[PDB]
C-alpha cells in the first residue's frame, strides 16, 4: 500500500512490498513437498493437467541440476527454468575448478546470493519461484535445503511449497522420519499428496516423484513409479 | 633443488635440500624450499623461484578462502587441482615442479605430482628437482611397500644425502616435514 | 497521526505510559479469563492456544471462544472440545491474517 | 514534513534523509536480539533462535558467522542482506591476507564494510543492505575488540554492545550494569550476557535457544559453544 | 514540490538540494578552528550517546599528511570517503613533485571532487563542511570548504550548532595576534560557550599545527590543559 | 550552576516533575533525589535516534 | 655498487657505496643508494637506478598511505609482498636488485629481492656488482648476535673490501642502523681516499677567449 513500485525503495515501516508480493505469488502455484529419510531424499509434486490437452510427460518441475542434485520447483515455471540453468552453470564451475561434486551448502549459498542479487536492484524484479534442493553423499548423508523468493536458504527435514503448505506439514511432522528408509517414504509422500485436494476445486492431478539417496548409489533420478505402483493401490486404501 | 615426498600408512613425509643457486654462484645457502599452504598441506617447489612463490601465494589465497567458506578442512586433491589449473593456464611462462602432499581426514596421506607441463597424477612417492634423477635411479630399488615413519625418515635422509652429495646444485642441509593425523613435525638434519 | 507538541508537554500530559501486547503470559491471562463461559472437560490446552495462535488481542481470543463455540454448535455438542479450540486457531488465525498496516503510534 | 515521499536518496528540508532512517528498523523486522560484552581478555556474543518448527533444523539457524580464523561476527536484520554482507566480509578479509601478508585486524574490516555500505548509500539505484553487523576479535597489544557496523556505514566500537529489537532496554541495563568497576573474570562476562538477555526478554529458558560465541586470549580462534557447556554455565549462574 | 532533482534550475532561486545539504551541515555537531600567529588550532565536540562508547576508535581531528590537519562538521561516513580521496590525491602529488603538497592545492582538488559529486544527477552531495589547515612555507593557513564545491579562507570560524553564536564570540574574543596556547584557550572557551555541560578530556578532541608539523594532542595534555582552563 | 540549557517551561516542568515524583512516594519535599531524577528523566537524552550523521 | 645487510642483536645495519657509473666512466661520486620507505623500514637498490628509484618511491607512498590509514607502525612483510607482487607483475622486465630491511613489533627483518620476484629472509645479504667481496668478508667473520660497534665495523670492512675490489666507490661508505627506538643515518662515515692536491694553477685569465656577441639582461 504505497510505495510498492520499486524493489529498491523502503516503506514507512521498513519492508519491501515487491518481495512480499513475489512471496505470495508462489502461493497460488501447485503444491510441491519434499522429505528426507536416513539414507536419501524423496521429492513429490502435485501436478495438474489443464483439461485434456497435455501429454502426461511434459514440463516436469522435477529438474536435475547435477549428477546428484535436482530441483523440485514451484511457482512461475520459466523463471525456475532459468534458475535451474544458473544452478547447472554453478555446479559446472565447481566441477571444472575443483574436480569433485559440489557440496550442497555452497551451491545453495551461491544460488541464494544470485536470488538476492535479483532482489536488490530496481531494474529487475524478484523471482517468482520457490524450490527444493536434495542431495546425497557417502561422507555427508542426506541434505535438504529450501529457498524462498527473498533468498533465505536453510535446511529442513521436510518441506512443502504450494497452496497446502501448512496443510501438508501438519501431517508431515507426524512421520517417524529417522527410522524409515526411503522406500517407505515413497508411499508416504504418495499418501500425503493424495490426501490434499482430491476433487474439490479442480478435476484431476497427477503425481511425479523424484528420488535420491544411497539406494541410487549417489545418483538422482525419477522413480520407476509404474514399478511397484505404490500410490494408487495404497491411495485407494487411504480414503478409509 | 632436489625435492622428495614419501607417503606411508599414517601420513606422508616430505624433504628438500636448500641451496638456491644462480648459474654457478650460490645466492642463498639455506632456504625453506617447502611451503605451508593449509595447516595440513605442504608443497615443495623447484624450477624457477619467483614463479613458484607467486603461484603458491595465490593458491594459498584461493584455498584459504574456499576452506573458510566450506567451514570444513580442505582436501589435498582440491589444492592439487588448483595448482593444475594455474600451472596449465600459464605453462608458457612458468617453470613449476610443484609437488602436493598432505594428510586429510577423509583420505589420509596423499602425494600428488605436478611437473613443468601441467599434468596431475597421484603417486605413492615422488622425486623432483634437477638433481633428482639419481635417487630416481634407486628410489625404485630401496623402496618397500608399507614402511613406517622412521623408515621413511631414514629413507628420505639417505635419498637427499646422496642427491646432495652428487649433484652440484644440490647440497646444503636437509629439511624434513612429517604430516599425519596428529601434527606436522619439522626438523633440520645433517648426515 | 496528527497531534500537538503542546499536547506532549509536562503539565497537560505530565505522565504517559506504554502497554505491550501480551508478554505471552498475559496471553495465558487473557486466555484463562477468556476461558470463562465455556462448557468443556477441563482439558483445554492453554499452552497450545497461547503459543500456536498469535492474535495479541482480547478481541482475538473473544473470536476464538466464539468460533470454538460455533464449532461445538457444529457437530452438535454442548461442550467445546480442545479440537474446537484448534479449529478456532486455524480459521480465526487465518482470517486474522487478512490485515495490513499492523502498527500505530503517533509522533 | 514529507511531502517528498522519500522515494530516492536525496536531501529533504530540515534537513535529514528518510531512507536510512527507514532502514534502521529493517533490523526490527528481524525479530531478533544480539548482545556483545567486552570486559577483560575475553569477549562474548549471545543471540537467541526463534524456531517454532520441529521439522526445521537447528544447526543451520546459526547467526554467529565465523568470518576468519580469529574473527567471528553476529548478524541481525533480514537474512539475505546479512549473508551477502558476510560473504563480502570473508572476501575482503581474504583480499587483505593476499595483499598485505598477515592477518587482518578487526578495525580495518569494519571500516571496509562501512565504506561499502556508504558506496551503496552514496550512489543510488541499489538497496542499502539493511542489516546490522557486530564484530569481535583479538588483537596483539590491544586485547579483544567489539565493534558495530551500521547499514548506513557508521562503525564504532566499545565495551558493552547490543543491537536488534529491544536494545534501548539492553543499553539501559548495560549503563545500569557497566558502571561498577569490578573485573570481568569470563564467567562474569558469560553470566552478565545470559542475565542481561534474561532480564530484557524475561524468559529464563533452556540452553538450546541462545547461541554463544566466545573468543579469549588463551585460544585466539573463534569458538562456538556446545549445548553441554552452555547448560553448565546456565546452571552455574543459577542462584 | 520541485527541485527534484539536480539537473534543473529553479524558477528564480538556487539549487535546493544543495541548500538542504548546507542545512544538514548546519544541523551537525559543532566545531571551532582558529589561526594564530605561529600555529593553527582545531577543536571539535565529540559526545558519546551512552556511557558505553569508546573514545579511542573514531577520530574527528585527522591528519592528511604530516603537516596538514583537517576537521569537519557533518557525517563521518562521507567524511572518511573524502578523507581517503584527499589521502590518495596528496600522495599522487607527492609522487609527481617529490614535495609535500600545499594546502591551497589540496583545497583546489578536494573542491573539484566535491563539485564533481554536485554535478548531475544521481548522486547526492556530501553532508560535510570541512575546515582545512596546515603550515606551508612559514605562514600557516586556514581553509573552509563546503558541500557546494566552494572554499574560503578564515582567521577563525565555526561550523555546526550555534555557529552564529560561536562566531559572535570569536569576533569579540579572538584577534589576529596570539600564540598557540592562547588560541587553544579561546578555542576551548568558544566550544565551552556552546557545548554540553560535561566537557572532559574525551568529549573534546584537539589537534594543532606547529610549523614543526601537525600534532594531534592526547587526552593527557587535553586533561592537563582543560583542567579548568579559565 | 549547571549548563545544558533548560527553559522556563522546562524549569517549571522539572519542579512539578520532582514534586509529584516525591509526593507519589508519600513524602514532604524532595531530598535532592527527584531533582536529579528530573534531570535524568527530562533532558531527555538527545533523542535516541539516530547517532548517525550528527 | 656493493650493498650489504646484516642483523645484529637488536636490528639491522645497512651499508652502501655511491659510485654511479654510466658505462665505463665515473659519473657520480655521491649517489644516495639508501632510500626512505617508512620511519622504520629502509631499502637499498642496485642495478638500474631509476627503476629502483621510481619503484621505491611508489612503494613508500603506498606504505605511507596504508600506515596513515591504519594508525600504527607498518610491517616489513607487507613491503615484501607489495614489492614481490609488483616485480613479478613486470615479469622481470624491470631490473631492480633490492635489499629490504626494517624493525617491526616482531623485531628486525631483512629481505633481499631478486628482480624477477624471488625473495629471501636472511641474517646477512650482499647485493650489487662487487657483492662477492662483501660476502667473503661476511662468510669469514660473521657470528650470531653481534653487538653494535662489532656489526658496524664488520659492514664497514665488507664495503671497504668491495671498494678495494673493482667497481666499488670513491665515496665515504654510507651506513644506516635501525633499532627498536633509534634510527640513524650517516653519510660521511669514513673517507679513506683524500684527493691529491693540484700541482699547477691552470687558471685562465680575464680575456683569454675571443667573444663574438655579448648580451646583458637585467632582472629584479
Ligand atoms: N520567566 C519565567 N519564569 C518562570 N516560568 C516561566 C518563565 N517564562 C516562562 N515560564 C514558564 O513557561 C510557560 C510559558 O508560557 P507557555 O504556555 O509555554 O507559552 P506557549 O504559548 O505554550 O508557547 P507559545 O510560543 O506561545 S505556543 C509559563 O506558563 C511558565 O510555566
Amino acid at each position: 500500500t504505497g510505495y510498492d513500485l520499486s524493489a529498491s525503495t523502503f516503506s514507512p515501516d521498513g519492508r519491501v512490498f515487491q518481495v512480499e508480493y513475489a512471496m505470495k505469488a508462489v502461493e497460488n502455484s501447485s503444491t510441491a513437498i519434499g522429505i528426507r529419510c536416513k539414507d536419501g531424499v524423496v521429492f513429490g509434486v502435485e501436478k495438474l493437467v489443464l483439461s485434456k490437452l497435455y501429454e502426461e510427460g511434459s514440463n516436469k518441475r522435477l529438474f536435475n541440476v547435477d549428477r546428484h542434485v535436482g530441483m523440485a520447483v514451484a511457482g512461475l515455471l520459466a523463471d525456475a527454468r532459468s534458475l535451474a540453468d544458473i544452478a547447472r552453470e554453478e555446479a559446472s564451475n565447481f566441477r571444472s575448478n575443483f574436480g569433485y561434486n559440489i557440496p550442497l551448502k555452497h551451491l545453495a549459498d551461491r544460488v541464494a546470493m544470485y536470488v538476492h542479487a535479483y532482489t536488490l536492484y530496481s531494474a529487475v524484479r524478484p523471482f517468482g519461484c520457490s524450490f527444493m534442493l536434495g542431495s546425497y553423499s557417502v561422507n555427508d548423508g542426506a541434505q535438504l535445503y529450501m529457498i524462498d523468493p527473498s533468498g533465505v536458504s536453510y535446511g529442513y527435514w521436510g518441506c512443502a511449497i504450494g497452496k497446502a503448505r501448512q496443510a501438508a506439514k501438519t501431517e508431515i511432522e507426524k512421520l517417524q522420519m529417522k527410522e524409515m528408509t526411503c522406500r517407505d517414504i515413497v508411499k508416504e509422500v504418495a499418501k500425503i499428496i493424495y490426501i490434499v485436494h482430491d476433487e474439490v476445486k479442480d478435476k484431476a492431478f497427477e503425481l511425479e516423484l523424484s528420488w535420491v539417496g544411497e539406494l541410487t548409489n549417489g545418483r538422482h533420478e525419477i522413480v520407476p513409479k509404474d514399478i511397484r505402483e505404490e500410490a494408487e493401490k495404497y491411495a485407494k486404501e487411504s480414503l478409509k | 633443488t632436489t625435492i622428495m615426498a614419501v607417503q606411508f600408512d599414517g601420513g606422508v613425509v616430505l624433504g628438500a635440500d636448500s641451496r638456491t643457486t644462480t648459474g654457478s654462484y650460490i645466492a642463498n645457502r639455506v632456504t625453506d624450499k617447502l611451503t605451508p599452504i593449509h595447516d595440513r598441506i605442504f608443497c615443495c617447489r623447484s624450477g624457477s623461484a619467483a614463479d613458484t612463490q607467486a603461484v603458491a601465494d595465490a593458491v594459498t589465497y584461493q584455498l584459504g578462502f574456499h576452506s573458510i567458506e566450506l567451514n570444513e578442512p580442505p582436501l589435498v586433491h582440491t589444492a592439487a587441482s588448483l595448482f593444475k589449473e594455474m600451472c596449465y593456464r600459464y605453462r608458457e611462462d612458468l617453470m613449476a615442479g610443484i609437488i602436493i602432499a598432505g594428510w586429510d581426514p577423509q583420505e589420509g596421506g596423499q602425494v600428488y605430482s605436478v611437473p613443468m607441463g601441467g599434468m596431475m597424477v597421484r603417486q605413492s612417492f615422488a622425486i623432483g628437482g634437477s638433481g633428482s634423477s639419481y635417487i630416481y635411479g634407486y628410489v625404485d630399488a630401496t623402496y618397500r611397500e608399507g614402511m613406517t615413519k622412521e623408515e621413511c625418515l631414514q629413507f628420505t635422509a639417505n635419498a637427499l644425502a646422496l642427491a646432495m652429495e652428487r649433484d652440484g646444485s644440490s647440497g646444503g642441509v636437509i629439511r624434513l616435514a612429517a604430516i599425519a593425523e596428529s601434527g606436522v613435525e619439522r626438523q633440520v638434519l645433517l648426515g | 497521526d496528527t497531534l500537538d507538541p503542546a499536547l506532549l508537554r509536562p503539565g497537560r500530559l505530565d505522565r504517559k505510559i506504554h502497554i505491550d501486547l501480551p508478554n505471552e503470559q498475559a496471553r495465558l491471562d487473557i486466555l484463562k479469563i477468556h476461558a470463562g463461559p465455556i462448557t468443556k472437560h477441563g482439558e483445554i490446552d492453554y499452552e497450545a492456544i497461547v503459543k500456536l495462535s498469535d492474535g495479541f488481542n482480547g478481541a482475538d481470543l473473544r473470536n476464538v471462544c466464539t468460533e470454538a463455540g460455533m464449532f461445538a454448535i457444529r457437530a452438535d455438542h454442548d461442550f467445546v472440545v480442545q479440537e474446537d479450540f484448534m479449529k478456532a486457531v486455524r480459521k480465526v488465525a487465518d482470517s486474522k491474517k487478512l490485515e495490513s498496516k499492523l502498527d500505530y503510534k503517533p509522533v | 514534513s514529507a511531502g517528498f515521499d522519500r522515494h530516492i536518496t536525496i536531501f529533504s528540508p530540515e534537513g535529514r534523509l528518510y531512507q536510512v532512517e527507514y532502514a534502521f528498523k529493517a533490523i526490527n523486522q528481524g525479530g531478533l536480539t544480539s548482545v556483545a560484552v567486552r570486559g577483560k581478555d575475553c569477549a562474548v556474543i549471545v543471540t537467541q533462535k526463534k524456531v517454532p518448527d520441529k521439522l526445521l533444523d537447528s544447526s543451520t539457524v546459526t547467526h554467529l558467522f565465523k568470518i576468519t580464523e580469529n574473527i567471528g561476527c553476529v548478524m541481525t536484520g533480514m537474512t539475505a542482506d546479512s549473508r551477502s554482507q558476510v560473504q563480502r566480509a570473508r572476501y575482503e578479509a581474504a583480499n587483505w591476507k593476499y595483499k598485505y601478508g598477515y592477518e587482518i585486524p578487526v578495525d580495518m574490516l569494519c571500516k571496509r564494510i562501512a565504506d561499502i555500505s556508504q558506496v551503496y548509500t552514496q550512489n543510488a539505484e541499489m538497496r542499502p543492505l539493511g542489516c546490522c553487523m557486530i564484530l569481535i576479535g583479538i588483537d596483539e597489544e590491544q586485547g579483544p575488540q567489539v565493534y558495530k557496523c551500521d547499514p548506513a556505514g557508521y562503525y564504532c566500537g566499545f565495551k558493552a554492545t547490543a543491537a536488534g529489537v529491544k536494545q534501548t532496554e539492553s543499553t539501559s541495563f548495560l549503563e545500569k550494569k557497566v558502571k561498577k568497576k569490578f573485573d570481568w573474570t569470563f564467567e562474569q562476562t558469560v553470566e552478565t550476557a545470559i542475565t542481561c538477555l534474561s532480564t530484557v526478554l524475561s524468559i529464563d529458558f533452556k540452553p538450546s535457544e541462545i547461541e554463544v560465541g566466545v573468543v579469549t586470549v588463551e585460544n585466539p580462534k573463534f569458538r562456538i559453544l556446545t549445548e553441554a557447556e552452555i547448560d553448565a554455565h546456565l546452571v552455574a549462574l543459577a542462584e | 514540490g520541485y527541485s527534484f532533482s539536480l539537473t534543473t534550475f529553479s524558477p528564480s532561486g538556487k539549487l535546493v538540494q544543495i541548500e538542504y545539504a548546507l542545512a544538514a551541515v548546519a544541523g551537525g555537531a559543532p566545531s571551532v578552528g582558529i589561526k594564530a600567529a605561529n600555529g593553527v588550532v582545531l577543536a571539535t565536540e565529540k559526545k558519546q550517546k551512552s556511557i558505553l562508547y569508546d573514545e579511542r576508535s573514531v577520530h574527528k581531528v585527522e591528519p592528511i599528511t604530516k603537516h596538514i590537519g583537517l576537521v569537519y562538521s557533518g557525517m563521518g561516513p562521507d567524511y572518511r570517503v573524502l578523507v581517503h580521496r584527499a589521502r590518495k590525491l596528496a600522495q599522487q602529488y607527492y609522487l609527481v613533485y617529490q614535495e609535500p603538497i600545499p594546502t591551497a592545492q589540496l583545497v583546489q582538488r578536494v573542491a573539484s571532487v566535491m563539485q564533481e559529486y554536485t554535478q548531475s544527477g544521481g548522486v547526492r552531495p556530501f553532508g560535510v563542511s570541512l575546515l582545512i589547515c596546515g603550515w606551508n612555507e612559514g605562514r600557516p593557513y586556514l581553509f573552509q570548504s563546503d558541500p557546494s564545491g566552494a572554499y574560503f579562507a578564515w582567521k577563525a570560524t565555526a561550523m555546526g550548532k550555534n555557529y552564529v553564536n560561536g562566531k559572535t564570540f570569536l569576533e569579540k574574543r579572538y584577534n589576529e595576534d596570539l600564540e598557540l596556547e592562547d588560541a587553544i584557550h579561546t578555542a576551548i572557551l568558544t566550544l565551552k560557550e556552546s557545548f554540553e555541560g560535561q566537557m572532559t578530556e574525551d568529549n573534546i578532541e584537539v589537534g594543532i599545527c606547529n610549523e614543526a608539523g601537525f600534532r594531534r594532542l592526547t587526552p593527557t595534555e587535553v586533561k592537563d590543559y582543560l583542567a579548568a582552563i579559565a | 550552576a549547571r549548563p545544558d540549557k533548560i527553559s522556563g517551561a522546562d524549569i517549571n516542568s522539572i519542579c512539578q516533575e520532582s514534586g509529584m515524583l516525591a509526593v507519589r512516594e508519600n513524602r514532604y519535599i524532595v531530598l535532592a533525589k527527584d531533582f536529579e531524577k528530573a534531570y535524568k528523566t527530562v533532558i531527555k537524552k538527545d533523542e535516541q535516534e539516530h547517532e548517525f550523521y550528527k | 655498487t656493493t650493498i650489504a645487510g646484516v642483523v645484529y642483536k637488536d636490528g639491522i645495519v645497512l651499508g652502501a657505496d655511491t659510485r654511479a657509473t654510466e658505462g665505463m666512466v665515473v659519473a657520480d661520486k655521491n649517489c644516495s643508494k639508501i632510500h626512505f620507505i617508512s620511519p622504520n623500514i629502509y631499502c637499498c637498490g642496485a642495478g638500474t637506478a631509476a627503476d629502483t628509484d621510481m619503484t621505491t618511491q611508489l612503494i613508500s607512498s603506498n606504505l605511507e598511505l596504508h600506515s596513515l590509514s591504519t594508525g600504527r607502525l607498518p610491517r616489513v612483510v607487507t613491503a615484501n609482498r607489495m614489492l614481490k607482487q609488483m616485480l613479478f607483475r613486470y615479469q622481470g622486465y624491470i631490473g631492480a636488485a633490492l635489499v629490504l630491511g626494517g624493525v617491526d613489533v616482531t623485531g628486525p627483518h631483512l629481505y633481499s629481492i631478486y628482480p624477477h620476484g624471488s625473495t629471501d629472509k636472511l641474517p646477512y645479504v650482499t647485493m650489487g656488482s662487487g657483492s662477492l667481496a662483501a660476502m667473503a668478508v661476511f662468510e669469514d667473520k660473521f657470528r650470531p648476535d653481534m653487538e653494535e660497534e662489532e656489526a658496524k665495523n664488520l659492514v664497514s670492512e665488507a664495503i671497504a673490501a668491495g671498494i678495494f675490489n673493482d667497481l666499488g666507490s670513491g665515496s665515504n661508505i654510507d651506513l644506516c642502523v635501525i633499532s627498536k627506538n633509534k634510527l640513524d643515518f650517516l653519510r660521511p662515515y669514513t673517507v679513506p681516499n683524500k684527493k691529491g692536491t693540484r700541482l699547477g694553477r691552470y687558471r685562465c685569465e680575464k680575456g683569454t677567449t675571443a667573444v663574438l656577441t655579448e648580451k646583458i639582461t637585467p632582472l629584479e
Side-chain angles (χ1 to χ4, degrees), chain D residues 122, chain E residues 6 18 22 25 78-79 82-83 85 89 106-120 123-130 132 144-151:
Chain D
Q122 181 74 42
Chain E
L6 196 55
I18 296 171
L22 292 174
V25 165
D78 287 335
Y79 173 67
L82 59 85
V83 159
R85 182 65 58 86
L89 181 144
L106 275 91
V107 170
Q108 292 298 114
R109 295 181 182 271
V110 169
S112 72
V113 173
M114 296 183 75
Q115 176 56 48
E116 194 267 328
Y117 280 181
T118 62
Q119 289 294 108
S120 296
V123 295
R124 71 183 177 272
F126 293 110
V128 167
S129 71
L130 300 173
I132 304 174
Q144 178 183 0
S145 72
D146 63 347
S148 71
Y151 63 98

Side-chain angles (χ1 to χ4, degrees), chain B residues 36-59:
Chain B
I37 302 97
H38 195 268
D39 297 330
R40 298 291 184 180
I41 297 170
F42 283 175
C43 71
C44 58
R45 61 191 186 271
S46 290
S48 177
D51 296 332
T52 58
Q53 287 179 355
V55 168
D57 293 332
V59 167

Side-chain angles (χ1 to χ4, degrees), chain A residues 3 13 113 116 153 155 157, chain D residues 5 29 55 57 81 83-84:
Chain A
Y3 297 150
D13 55 356
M113 291 307 111
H116 180 197
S153 180
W157 284 280
Chain D
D5 294 326
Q29 281 90 26
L55 289 172
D57 291 333
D81 288 340
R83 290 182 184 177
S84 293

Side-chain angles (χ1 to χ4, degrees), chain E residues 4-13 15-31 33-47 52-55 57-76:
Chain E
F4 288 102
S5 295
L6 196 55
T7 186
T8 180
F9 284 165
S10 73
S12 70
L15 302 172
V16 185
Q17 296 288 318
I18 296 171
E19 291 181 354
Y20 287 162
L22 292 174
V25 165
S31 174
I34 295 169
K35 189 260 182 184
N38 53 0
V40 186
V41 177
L42 292 174
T44 185
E45 203 277 339
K46 186 176 181 181
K47 282 183 74 67
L52 299 170
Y53 290 165
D54 196 3
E55 291 84 2
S57 65
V58 183
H59 303 294
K60 304 293 187 68
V61 172
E62 182 68 31
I64 302 300
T65 323
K66 66 178 72 174
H67 64 92
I68 298 159
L70 197 145
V71 300
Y72 76 107
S73 299
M75 52 187 71

Side-chain angles (χ1 to χ4, degrees), chain E residues 156-158 162-171 190 193-194:
Chain E
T157 188
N162 298 114
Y163 66 99
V164 285
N165 301 114
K167 188 176 178 183
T168 55
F169 183 72
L170 286 172
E171 195 274 333
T190 186
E193 183 67 30
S194 297

Side-chain angles (χ1 to χ4, degrees), chain A residues 1-104 106-138 140-198 200 202 204-218 220-240:
Chain A
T1 67
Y3 297 150
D4 52 353
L5 291 174
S6 178
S8 176
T9 64
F10 279 159
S11 69
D13 55 356
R15 64 184 185 270
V16 175
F17 287 101
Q18 292 291 326
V19 180
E20 298 292 326
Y21 294 158
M23 281 184 180
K24 70 181 180 67
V26 188
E27 184 67 28
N28 296 116
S29 179
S30 67
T31 300
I33 71 168
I35 179 67
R36 71 180 183 179
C37 70
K38 63 180 178 292
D39 55 345
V41 179
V42 174
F43 289 158
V45 175
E46 184 179 3
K47 193 174 186 183
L48 51 91
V49 179
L50 295 173
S51 180
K52 199 177 171 66
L53 295 169
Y54 190 70
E55 201 182 358
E56 193 179 4
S58 174
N59 64 10
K60 295 180 290 295
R61 285 190 291 273
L62 297 175
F63 288 153
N64 200 357
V65 174
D66 200 74
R67 185 66 182 86
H68 58 92
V69 169
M71 292 169 77
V73 307
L76 297 179
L77 186 58
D79 197 4
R81 295 177 184 275
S82 174
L83 199 275
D85 282 330
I86 293 299
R88 292 172 193 268
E89 199 271 336
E90 186 68 28
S92 300
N93 296 119
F94 192 82
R95 183 66 56 84
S96 64
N97 288 320
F98 299 97
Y100 70 102
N101 290 319
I102 177 68
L104 195 63
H106 190 268
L107 179 62
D109 292 332
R110 299 293 294 165
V111 171
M113 291 307 111
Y114 189 76
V115 176
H116 180 197
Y118 276 97
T119 62
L120 287 170
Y121 295 100
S122 70
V124 294
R125 70 168 187 264
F127 281 162
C129 293
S130 180
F131 61 95
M132 300 285 289
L133 287 174
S135 171
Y136 185 76
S137 177
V138 294
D140 295 325
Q143 287 81 11
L144 180 61
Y145 285 162
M146 174 64 193
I147 287 94
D148 58 350
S150 70
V152 182
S153 180
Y154 58 91
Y156 283 154
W157 284 280
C159 185
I161 299 164
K163 270 80 67 180
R165 185 180 60 83
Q166 295 178 358
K169 70 184 180 182
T170 302
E171 69 274 17
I172 284 170
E173 68 177 1
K174 63 166 61 65
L175 295 180
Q176 190 59 254
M177 69 192 81
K178 301 293 192 291
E179 287 79 2
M180 295 177 185
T181 63
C182 276
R183 197 170 64 245
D184 300 328
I185 306 298
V186 173
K187 69 183 180 68
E188 297 294 323
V189 174
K191 88 177 83 171
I192 293 299
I193 299 300
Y194 190 78
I195 278 174
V196 50
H197 189 275
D198 54 357
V200 181
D202 299 330
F205 65 97
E206 200 275 333
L207 180 60
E208 282 85 357
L209 298 177
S210 179
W211 187 56
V212 66
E214 194 270 334
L215 204 148
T216 67
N217 291 318
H220 187 191
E221 68 265 15
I222 189 165
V223 285
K225 186 258 167 293
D226 48 356
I227 295 300
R228 293 173 62 88
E229 200 256 330
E230 289 290 326
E232 293 84 5
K233 288 293 290 182
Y234 188 77
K236 293 178 179 64
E237 294 179 353
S238 68
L239 57 91
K240 66 185 182 294

